[PDB]
Design a protein around this ligand. Structure first.
Ligand code: NA
Lengths: 66, 66
């Protein structure tokens, strides 16, 4: 299980869902889906998110060790 | 593009493919495949690799735009 903090980090930076989607070249539905915990992103999308949000990836997507 | 440093990092830490595969509960072939850049892991598997290698995920898998 991964717990994500994307909503909070995105909102803190004052970035809307459509703004982030446009930067990452994905759909708003994709961003919203991640934030509503419907599913995890691909490795590549996770890495793009961390890159542009200038935040260590593990601050955004936290695997609960098991 | 994704730069992949898994082999280099695993090797410096003197963890065999077999031992890493066992911690991750995947085939050794799967670790080998990821090391040789044949395919990418899911995000969760990537986070587990980072956990067992005690290394930030972005030092193992480095995405660069363009
Ligand atoms: Na990282």
């Amino acid at each position: 299980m991964i717990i994500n903090n994307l909503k909070l980090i995105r909102e803190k930076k004052k970035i809307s869902q459509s703004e982030l989607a446009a930067l990452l070249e994905v759909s708003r539905q994709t961003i919203n889906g991640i934030e509503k915990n419907k599913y995890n992103p691909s490795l590549q999308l996770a890495l793009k998110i961390a890159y542009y949000l200038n935040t260590p990836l593990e601050d955004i997507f936290q695997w609960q060790p098991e």
